[PDB]
Design a protein around this ligand. Structure first.
Ligand SMILES: Cc1noc(C)c1-c1ccc2c(c1)ncn2Cc1ccc(Cl)cc1
Length: 113
């Protein structure tokens, strides 16, 4: 696929995540442990990812196959589930966003091939 054609296929899945409010709000920027007052974050999460980074990569054509994008999205979720406690707001927001993502990406992927 051409860069723009793949971007157009994937973009609605990313838009769906941004549309979730308040659940996407912690995910719209890189985690900033210094500002958040959580100095253990980068001792635990070695490969950070967030929506703004995925958006930039998508908009600049860096995703050359769908699994490359899907992998980044799951990285973002898996980092949040690793770091945050199960009872925390962010963990619960992560679970909601993952459910939204599955609902959006599965039909997209089913339509590639
Ligand atoms: C995502 C994520 N994964 O682990 C942590 C910590 C975060 C996190 C937690 C709070 C964050 C954040 C990122 N970026 C900004 N904030 C503050 C904030 C808290 C709740 C809402 Cl609704 C919006 C921003």
């Amino acid at each position: 696929f051409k860069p723009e054609e793949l971007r157009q296929a994937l973009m609605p899945t990313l838009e769906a995540l941004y549309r979730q409010d308040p659940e996407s709000l912690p995910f719209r920027q890189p985690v900033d442990p210094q500002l958040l007052g959580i100095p253990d974050y980068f001792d635990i999460v070695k490969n950070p990812m967030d929506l703004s980074t995925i958006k930039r990569k998508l908009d600049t054509g860096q995703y050359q196959e769908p699994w490359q994008y899907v992998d980044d999205v799951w990285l973002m979720f898996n980092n949040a589930w690793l770091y945050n406690r199960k009872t925390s707001r962010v963990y619960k927001f992560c679970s909601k966003l993952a459910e939204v993502f599955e609902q959006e990406i599965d039909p997209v992927m089913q339509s590639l091939g």
